[PDB]
């Protein structure tokens, strides 16, 4: 059975994702940001809609609650070609292979962006209440083997420098949401390294009230939110049960950690040397090369531009 | 490896179904048979206020034009997110204590009130019909159903509409309960049409202008596929963008591997008990993954229950 | 506190450690291969007698228990400037900072590798007891925060090519020791992988006689030799405590893959793009720093040459 | 938390240790004193063939000129690792379930027969004094000494030499009685010494051609590190290598922190029990890092026992 490398170029948006996975014919195929869908296809300029919504309820012009629905129902837009993508692609998937490979899928975003890491950044904006987040949380797909999640570090100055000139159709700069988004990234990348040491959330959750990362810079710490809690200050267990489901789907994630500090040529041979550590799968039939191909092909056609 | 039997009584509101299952059980001993009930407390408190309340409310000033269709549908979204959260959750702790089927007593009975095609694509396909959810959101609901685990037992009710319409008015929206009718006749048509070997995809051309677990293979056009020929989902080829087709392809897959049963609610609350028990013969259980699976699937469903279902 | 930054090259002898530490001033401290304790200090050509002795077992001129000896004695002198080094840093190391660093601390292999990869490779040469093996695991330093670990990438024909032109002083070209060592590392990444995953040793230990990798591509399989169970077949505690120790100290080390497939060039900013997802740590003094680099050059000019 | 008393009995073999420790377990309840004994079965049989005979074989053919030092070296250093094993594997294991010292009845108390410090630091010593191992080896040994846990209490023996020849012979390797014998003696001062703030760097130049926790600062001749003064750790400008150096700043903080008793054995197997008795008085407890960790300390405890001594 051929062999398969999954890549998810992921983390904050404005580093360079795109720059780096365009510069790069049938061994290595890519799926591109689904602008199209965000735009036309799901609804009409999705991304502006969300950032027109932050700005209203920065300018009181609307309430929190009216800013949190906006948000939600913005949010099952953005995820929907990821959420579609992952579901006919999962089937296909079969164990891992071990330490080429017959094709390399290189993704824009994986699911945990729209589901996990958004969501959670507009919580922190007040735009979202922490209820939602873990309802996309608990939608998290199965992790798959083989999850490779390449997050991206650069230094805020840089970030915004290279923010502003790359703005999207509809986006605002916003200063306050990028260092939401760029704050949850850091906790993803200290949560997955915190599961897979042995963290584990239930014994370590008093110390948010008193080797690996403590519980205080992973994702847990976001959720400590008193819409969660009862009257005595415990979690609700289905609050709970949800954030057992983070840890669970977060762990078994393979991160790579890009430096985007550097010329586009730097960080695509840079992303390209990052692939030897990463973890490859079987699939399922001889067959399923081809079809994930034209997948992918199809997406991008339709989706990407 | 101690077996299970997974029931998921569902089908639209107002039939019996609540009752029905408390008098299920009542039936059995004290723990070979735990029951998951509706979550009403995450819906009026814990994940939001009032969140039916705020539903009908929304449906009813669309209705009189004091909203928008898009602003309808931004509320409808989010409060299904709510909905169904509890179901979603539970489906993913319980997931991994599943193991393979066995056969048609078990050592653990667990009846939950619904399952996530519920508020995954159920009332959300019938929101779509009252105009107040745009077709694209309720296939994003569908394309984020969790994999079907093995054992998934679905029980869907049957009454006249006069009989349902009686029982429902103690608002009363009749449009609503004849589209959640609807969409649940459409259901179970899916299943069936999926198991007699249908492909949405070959029949598809088709389309233009219940039995789940018997009868012939039904028309394309009485199934859930026909609800999603809607215009924004048409490329200008007149065919189904990639996205949305896959979105069907995913409800195809969720759908066929399910065992649903359809129970005549037109009877006493014990009439329906012991149909429903009757029912339970044919139904398929699973092996569990550990010896300790059991408990915790106890604890699991009584903890449940404790917070949510009152 | 200052922060630190510690990364040990390991992997395979033979691939181009040596040349990609080497290509790269007080910010960044290398403490090389201790060569000179090897061959004179702690006692006289230890290579040379390793190899030696492994090509006279081969040739039938001493048996499997005079190599065992000669090989366990051996692999004190070749791991003593680790141990002693891990031992007098092991204090000054605090918790992790987090997602520059005051310093850059570069090692040439870690204290694993003299402890457990080469014991456990010469072992498979039928070289050593599986009991010696344990019993070094038994001794691994407690794995201490920011552990990053850098494990290489090379194609076994171009490994051979590449070792063949390097070879060290009293070094035999030895293409089963060769493949024993590739496959211990490759098993290595395999383990800490596992355990990042969730694996319990105990639990699929079942499997080796029926999303993490099999427990049949794992360290783990090389312990079901016949010498360390009972007559019943079941592992005796002494073993399996040993086992437990593997699986802690493996656990919570940070393994990154460098691709030594390229130029000499290529491998160092390889390795440089690598840094960015390593763990950093504070120090627990004021004036770690400064002592950290004098035990650095005091070790490298004393027995790097 | 519930409190943990740790006691490690050692010091050179022959002088009754053994009984000692078994006669004091009798006399506590069942389960609050666990001893682990002497892991003779993985010396004998488990870890290689007769440990303990080759070790003895090997000097033997060494004085006899049948063997050269090397030859030796590689025998005791490998042999020596062996022996250790047992007590560095249920070091590791029970590192984790110690806390912080509390103060000098507890819910348990672990007698130990021996610490792991006479396999890697005391018989290896011994052994190069026997020219059968080399200094080098010894000070690797020295660096692989895992870190003291806080209430590490060691108890060696005094004993006349004379009643030590009478009760070890029933080989008796004379020699090798008084290296074992000086080697325990410059311990206990080694242990003193630094307590009472010396500093070997400082004194270091002191050299040239016991009590444990009382007394005044032992002269550093009269410590253990006078034995490596060797040439062979020796640079050409007279001072230790730093890599050796720094071997020697380990075994300080190894023995620094470390609670040194002397029993006397020169009376009867009761006399000595009871001394023993009097002796846990004076000796550091430590809390344990959870609830389960005393159960778990127990069973590791037997398990050993069962498995290995005897
Ligand atoms: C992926 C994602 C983005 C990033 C898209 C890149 O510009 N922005 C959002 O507001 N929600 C999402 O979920
Ligand atoms: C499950 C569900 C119901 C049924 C709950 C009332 O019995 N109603 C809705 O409007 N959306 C849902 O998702
Ligand atoms: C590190 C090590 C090497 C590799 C040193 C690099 O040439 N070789 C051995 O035989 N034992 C060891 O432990
Ligand atoms: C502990 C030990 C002993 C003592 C065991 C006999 O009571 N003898 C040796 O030769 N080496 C050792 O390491």
């Keep these: 059975m051929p062999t398969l490398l999954r ?17 790069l014919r049938d061994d290595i195929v890519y799926v591109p940001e689904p602008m199209t869908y965000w735009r036309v296809l799901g609804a009409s300029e999705t991304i502006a809609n969300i950032y027109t919504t932050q700005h209203r309820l920065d300018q009181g012009e609307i309430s929190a609650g009216d800013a949190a629905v906006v948000m939600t129902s913005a949010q099952i837009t953005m995820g929907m070609p990821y959420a579609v993508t992952d579901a006919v692609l999962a089937p ?19 699911p945990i962006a729209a589901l996990l890491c958004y969501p959670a ?12 987040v873990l309802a996309f949380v608990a939608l998290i797909p199965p992790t798959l083997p083989g999850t490779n999640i390449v997050l991206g570090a650069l230094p ?10 790359r703005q999207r159709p509809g986006e605002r700069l916003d200063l306050a949401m990028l260092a939401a988004i760029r704050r949850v990234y850091g906790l993803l990348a200290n949560t997955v390294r915190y599961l897979q040491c042995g963290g584990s959330w239930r014994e370590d959750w008093g110390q948010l009230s008193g080797p690996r990362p403590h519980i205080g810079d992973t994702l847990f710490t976001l959720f400590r939110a008193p819409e969660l809690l009862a009257p005595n200050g415990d979690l609700y267990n289905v609050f709970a049960w949800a954030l057992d489901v983070l840890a669970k789907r977060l762990r078994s994630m ?3 950690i890009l430096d985007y500090d550097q010329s586009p040529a730097g960080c ?12 490859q799968t079987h699939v399922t039939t001889p067959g399923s090369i081809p079809t994930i191909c034209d997948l992918a092909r199809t997406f991008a056609r339709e989706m990407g531009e």
Tied chains: 1, 3.
């Design 7 to 23: 890549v998810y170029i992921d983390g904050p948006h404005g580093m360079g994702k795109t720059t780096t996975t365009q510069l």
């Design 92 to 110: 296909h998937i079969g164990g891992e292979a071990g330490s080429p490979p017959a094709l390399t899928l290189i993704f824009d975003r994986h």
């Design 121 to 132: 950044a507009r919580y922190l904006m007040g735009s979202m209440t922490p209820q939602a």
């Design 156 to 165: 805020e100055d840089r970030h915004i420098d290279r923010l502003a000139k």
């Design 254 to 256: 393979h991160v790579f």
């Design 268 to 279: 695509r041979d840079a992303l390209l040397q990052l692939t030897s550590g990463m973890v």
